[PDB]
Design an enzyme around this catalytic site. Structure first.
Site, PDB file in Angstrom:
ATOM      1  N   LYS A  19     -23.257  33.543   7.082  1.00  0.00           N
ATOM      2  CA  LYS A  19     -22.358  33.864   8.021  1.00  0.00           C
ATOM      3  C   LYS A  19     -23.076  34.125   9.530  1.00  0.00           C
ATOM      4  O   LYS A  19     -23.837  34.905   9.657  1.00  0.00           O
ATOM      5  CB  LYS A  19     -21.828  34.824   7.561  1.00  0.00           C
ATOM      6  CG  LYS A  19     -20.496  34.946   8.396  1.00  0.00           C
ATOM      7  CD  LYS A  19     -19.816  36.263   8.898  1.00  0.00           C
ATOM      8  CE  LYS A  19     -19.080  36.253   7.382  1.00  0.00           C
ATOM      9  NZ  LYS A  19     -17.483  35.694   6.946  1.00  0.00           N
ATOM     10  N   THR A  22     -18.196  34.678  13.378  1.00  0.00           N
ATOM     11  CA  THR A  22     -16.708  34.908  12.731  1.00  0.00           C
ATOM     12  C   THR A  22     -15.578  34.732  13.613  1.00  0.00           C
ATOM     13  O   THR A  22     -15.361  34.357  15.072  1.00  0.00           O
ATOM     14  CB  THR A  22     -16.885  36.337  13.433  1.00  0.00           C
ATOM     15  OG1 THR A  22     -15.905  37.180  12.084  1.00  0.00           O
ATOM     16  CG2 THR A  22     -17.279  37.681  14.393  1.00  0.00           C
ATOM     17  N   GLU A  72     -19.314  30.654   8.172  1.00  0.00           N
ATOM     18  CA  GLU A  72     -18.425  31.678   7.527  1.00  0.00           C
ATOM     19  C   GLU A  72     -18.888  31.958   6.389  1.00  0.00           C
ATOM     20  O   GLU A  72     -18.019  33.607   6.191  1.00  0.00           O
ATOM     21  CB  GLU A  72     -16.778  31.815   8.036  1.00  0.00           C
ATOM     22  CG  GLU A  72     -16.327  32.221   9.753  1.00  0.00           C
ATOM     23  CD  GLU A  72     -15.619  33.679   8.784  1.00  0.00           C
ATOM     24  OE1 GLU A  72     -16.849  34.424   8.893  1.00  0.00           O
ATOM     25  OE2 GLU A  72     -15.172  34.293  10.248  1.00  0.00           O
TER      26      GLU A  72
END
Ligand SMILES: Nc1ccn([C@@H]2O[C@H](CO)[C@@H](O)[C@H]2O)c(=O)n1
Ligand SMILES: [Mg+2]
EC number: 3.5.1.135
Length: 101
Positions: A19, A22, A72
């Site tokens: 990831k 965000t 993500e």
């Protein structure tokens, strides 16, 4: 003190580099490229890493992309479902791209 938190179920994805962005709402639109931020778990506010913000951009519900979801570490359907729960009724968002230091 932590500058930002993530749900703890994201902790390993972040430390492993799966990831790398965000998606947040206006309350976290102040983070910006070059920021070095202490990161904790949402559930217990426990520190787990320091990130460097490498890029930011704005996005809307109807302009989120497959690539945002990939960064993500989600499918697009998964990302929209999490946004519908976390930011109900909201359409304006802020992308924070980062790396774990
Ligand atoms: N893309 C996102 C957006 C939010 N969050 C977590 O949800 C909390 C409330 O917005 C935030 O404080 C954060 O812990 C997340 O983990 N990932
Ligand atoms: Mg849901």
């Amino acid at each position: 003190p932590n500058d930002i938190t993530f749900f703890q179920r994201f902790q390993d994805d972040i430390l492993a580099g799966r990831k790398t962005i965000t998606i947040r709402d206006e309350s976290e639109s102040h983070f910006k490229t070059g920021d070095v931020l202490r990161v904790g778990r949402f559930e217990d506010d426990g520190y787990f890493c320091t990130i460097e913000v490498t890029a930011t951009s704005t996005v809307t519900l109807d302009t989120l992309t497959e690539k945002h979801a990939e960064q993500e570490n989600m499918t697009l359907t998964e990302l929209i479902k999490v946004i519908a729960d976390i930011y109900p009724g909201q359409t304006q968002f802020y992308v924070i791209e980062f790396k774990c230091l």
